[PDB]
Amino acid sequence: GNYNVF
Amino acid sequence: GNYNVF
Amino acid sequence: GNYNVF
Amino acid sequence: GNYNVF
Amino acid sequence: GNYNVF
Amino acid sequence: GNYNVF
Amino acid sequence: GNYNVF
Amino acid sequence: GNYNVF
Amino acid sequence: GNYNVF
Amino acid sequence: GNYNVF
């Protein structure tokens, strides 16, 4: 999966 | 899946 | 799935 | 599914 | 499903 | 409180 | 409170 | 509190 | 608190 | 606190 986490 | 989390 | 979470 | 959650 | 939740 | 539950 | 329940 | 639960 | 739970 | 949980 793709995770862009801030 | 795709997760863009802020 | 797609999750855009703020 | 698609989740846009604010 | 599609969930746009505010 | 605010509860949006699916 | 506010409850939106599905 | 705020609860958005899927 | 804020809870966005999937 | 803030909890975004998948």
Author numbering:
A (entry chain A), B (entry chain A), C (entry chain A), D (entry chain A), E (entry chain A), F (entry chain A), ...: 286 to 291
The authors write:
The protein hnRNPA2 functions in RNA stabilization, splicing, trafficking, and translation. In its role in protecting mRNAs, it is a component of cytoplasmic stress granules, one of the so-called membraneless organelles (MLOs).
A missense point mutation that converts a conserved aspartic acid to a valine (D290V) in hnRNPA2-LCD was identified in 2013 as being associated with ALS and MSP2. To investigate the structural differences between the wildtype and the mutant, we crystallized the hexamer segment 286GNYNVF291 containing the disease-causing mutation and determined its structure by X-ray crystallography. As expected, the crystal structure of the mutant segment forms a steric zipper motif and the sidechains of the two β-sheets mate tightly with each other in a dry interface. The area buried (Ab) and shape complementarity (Sc) for the mutant segment are 104 Å2 per chain and 0.86, respectively. The mutant segment structure forms in-register, parallel β-sheets. The backbones of the wildtype structure and the mutant segment fit well with each other, whereas the sidechain of Asp290 in the wildtype structure clashes with Asn289 of the mating sheet of mutant steric zipper, disrupting the steric zipper formation. The results suggest that the mutant segment with the pathogenic mutation forms a more stable structure than the WT segment, and converts a gel-promoting segment into an aggregation-promoting segment. Unsurprisingly, the mutant segment is an outlier in terms of having greater energetic stability than any hexameric segment in either hnRNPA2 or FUS.
